[PDB]
Amino acid sequence: QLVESGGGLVQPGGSLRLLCVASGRPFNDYDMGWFRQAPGKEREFVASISWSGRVTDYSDSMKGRCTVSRDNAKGTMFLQMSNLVPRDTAVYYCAAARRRWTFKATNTEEFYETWGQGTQVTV
Amino acid sequence: FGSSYPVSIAFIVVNEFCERFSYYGMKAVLTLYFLYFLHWNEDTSTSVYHAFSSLCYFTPILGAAIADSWLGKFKTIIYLSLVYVLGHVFKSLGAIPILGGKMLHTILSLVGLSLIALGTGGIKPCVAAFGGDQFEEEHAEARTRYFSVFYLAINAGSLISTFITPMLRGDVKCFGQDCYALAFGVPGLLMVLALVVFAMGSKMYRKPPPEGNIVAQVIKCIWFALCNRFRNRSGDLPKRQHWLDWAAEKYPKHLIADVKALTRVLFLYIPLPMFWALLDQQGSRWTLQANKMNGDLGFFVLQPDQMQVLNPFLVLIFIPLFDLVIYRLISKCRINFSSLRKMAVGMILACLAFAVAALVETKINGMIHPEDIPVNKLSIAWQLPQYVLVTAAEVMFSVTGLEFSYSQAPSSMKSVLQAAWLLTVAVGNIIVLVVAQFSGLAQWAEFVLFSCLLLVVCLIFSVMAYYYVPLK
Ligand SMILES: Cc1onc(-c2ccccc2Cl)c1C(=O)N[C@@H]1C(=O)N2[C@@H]1SC(C)(C)[C@@H]2C(=O)O
Numbered sequence: 001q002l003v004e005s006g007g008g009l010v011q012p013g014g015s016l017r018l019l020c021v022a023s024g025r026p027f028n029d030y031d032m033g034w035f036r037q038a039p040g041k042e043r044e045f046v047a048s049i050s051w052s053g054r055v056t057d058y059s060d061s062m063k064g065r066c067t068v069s070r071d072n073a074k075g076t077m078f079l080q081m082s083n084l085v086p087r088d089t090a091v092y093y094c095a096a097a098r099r100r101w102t103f104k105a106t107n108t109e110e111f112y113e114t115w116g117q118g119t120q121v122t123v
Numbered sequence: 124f125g126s127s128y129p130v131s132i133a134f135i136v137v138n139e140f141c142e143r144f145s146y147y148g149m150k151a152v153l154t155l156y157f158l159y160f161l162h163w164n165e166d167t168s169t170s171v172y173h174a175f176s177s178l179c180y181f182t183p184i185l186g187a188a189i190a191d192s193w194l195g196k197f198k199t200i201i202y203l204s205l206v207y208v209l210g211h212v213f214k215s216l217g218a219i220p221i222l223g224g225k226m227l228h229t230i231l232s233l234v235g236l237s238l239i240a241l242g243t244g245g246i247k248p249c250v251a252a253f254g255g256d257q258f259e260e261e262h263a264e265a266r267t268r269y270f271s272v273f274y275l276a277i278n279a280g281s282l283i284s285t286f287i288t289p290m291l292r293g294d295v296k297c298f299g300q301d302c303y304a305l306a307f308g309v310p311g312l313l314m315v316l317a318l319v320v321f322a323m324g325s326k327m328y329r330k331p332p333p334e335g336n337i338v339a340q341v342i343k344c345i346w347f348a349l350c351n352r353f354r355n356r357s358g359d360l361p362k363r364q365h366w367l368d369w370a371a372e373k374y375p376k377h378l379i380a381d382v383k384a385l386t387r388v389l390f391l392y393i394p395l396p397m398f399w400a401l402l403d404q405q406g407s408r409w410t411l412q413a414n415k416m417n418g419d420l421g422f423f424v425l426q427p428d429q430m431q432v433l434n435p436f437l438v439l440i441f442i443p444l445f446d447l448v449i450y451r452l453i454s455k456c457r458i459n460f461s462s463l464r465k466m467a468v469g470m471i472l473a474c475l476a477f478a479v480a481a482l483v484e485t486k487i488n489g490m491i492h493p494e495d496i497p498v499n500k501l502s503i504a505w506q507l508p509q510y511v512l513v514t515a516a517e518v519m520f521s522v523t524g525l526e527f528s529y530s531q532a533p534s535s536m537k538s539v540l541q542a543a544w545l546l547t548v549a550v551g552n553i554i555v556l557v558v559a560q561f562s563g564l565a566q567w568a569e570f571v572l573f574s575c576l577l578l579v580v581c582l583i584f585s586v587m588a589y590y591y592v593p594l595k
Binding site for chain 1: 158159161162163164165166167170225229
């Protein structure tokens with residue numbers, strides 16, 4: 001709960017490492033995901049990391065190659081983007097979903113309940 | 124071919140091999156299908172997987188009830204195999220992304236899983252009982268060899284399933300995405316082939332008819348027996364010499380004897396779920412133990428996960444070895460293994476295997492330095508002795524249990540006792556789930572605990588097996 005984010009401008013072919021720290025209940029309880037919202041577009045799926053980090057998923061695009069990692073101590077989550085391009089110069093959000101039983105896709109906006117403010121990574 | 128072995132068991136062992144091949148090939152990819160095709164939560168995927176496994180373990184009760192109480196077997200096998208094929212068709216149809224999405228996929232997959240569980244629970248006991256029914260009651264020595272070959276076929280199917288499954292889901296694009304339809308359809312074709320080969324031998328089988336609504340008669344007999352003693356303010360002869368003797372105003376002696384044998388065998392089997400639960404807690408902890416020990420082996424680098432395949436291979440080696448050499452050598456002398464001493468010896472071997480695992484963990488912990496490498500870092504070897512002991516226990520226990528269940532069952536309820544044998548596995552698997560969450564002990568102290576528990580269960584089973592009254 002109370003998720004945050006951090007990031008900024010990157011080189012045309014550089015790399016970025018976005019943070020997401022939860023300042024609420026324990027971080028091991030929530031399933032986490034990353035979303036992006038390019039200007040004048042719809043919020044897209046980027047990557048998802050399950051509680052305990054055992055299961056990971058990335059969007060078909062995954063421009064370059066992403067990597068989502070999390071530690072449940074200090075409640076922090078890292079996204080490593082490698083081969084960013086002029087495109088995907090979007091606002092990146094962090095979403096957290098409390099563990100429960102559901103049939104909704106883990107890669108959809110409806111699966112997650114709390115969204116933090118998004119960074120403004122640009123290329 | 125020559126004699127003493129009908130040609131029919133060919134299309135029993137082959138059918139079992141194909142069925143296990145398909146079942147394991149599907150179950151291997153089930154979780155990945157849940158996670159990366161349906162995009163389900165980890166909790167939801169794991170819960171659905173465990174529910175499907177539990178239903179598969181528990182459905183043989185219904186299958187055996189159908190078979191023995193009505194329709195006989197070879198007609199429950201055929202119809203439940205048709206249901207199995209329908210479930211496979213539904214499951215493979217729900218993995219096609221072209222038609223529907225996220226609603227048709229889920230519904231079709233769940234319905235297919237339900238049908239697959241129904242089919243497996245009802246092809247499991249019925250097939251074994253039907254194959255055992257092909258031998259004359261006098262040929263009690265060929266039946267044991269047939270059961271050994273049956274277990275060998277099961278294990279071989281599992282092994283080829285492990286060796287062949289990763290190829291199906293390896294860089295295959297069904298329609299622009301990972302090809303799960305092929306992964307779920309190849310097992311469907313395997314099950315279709317198994318059904319075809321089983322049905323091909325119809326004219327050679329020895330189909331015996333059911334002896335009536337045996338399950339209802341058994342339930343009613345037990346109910347009357349229990350309700351007769353309730354002489355709260357009276358009673359001179361409610362029941363003496365047994366708790367079923369004075370359930371004799373009805374239910375002629377030929378039924379009271381059958382229910383007596385059933386109850387005796389069930390009371391004997393009571394403690395087997397604990398043995399199954401204790402023995403199941405080795406495919407997960409031993410992987411962790413392997414993760415802490417060197418696995419180069421000089422010639423070929425072995426991963427901790429790959430060591431799991433050493434169980435079916437050792438079973439394949441041991442079954443012929445036990446059947447043809449060790450048992451024959453024991454029989455050479457006056458030593459008599461009565462098919463209940465075999466199970467106790469298997470329990471003792473499992474306890475020894477877990478004690479050896481605890482010893483290996485203790486050796487691992489005692490590591491001291493001389494990228495630095497610990498001198499006292501064990502190679503992936505030293506896990507063989509516990510894999511050898513645990514595998515021998517499984518061969519001695521599981522193979523003997525199938526024969527003991529059939530040999531000690533009344534002709535009217537031969538497949539009911541086979542469901543009782545599988546019922547212990549179902550209950551034992553339930554115990555594993557309840558105990559899995561509770562994990563706060565050291566690996567060495569956990570293995571020593573399992574060894575002691577396996578010893579306590581062995582003594583309980585040994586004492587009860589000592590007082591067991593064999594069927595006659
Ligand atoms: C234990 C046990 O209890 N009933 C059976 C059994 C008996 C008949 C048909 C199918 C099965 Cl799975 C059984 C058993 O171990 N069967 C077979 C056996 O042993 N193998 C299969 S299952 C397995 C893949 C886990 C195991 C292995 O390869 O390690």
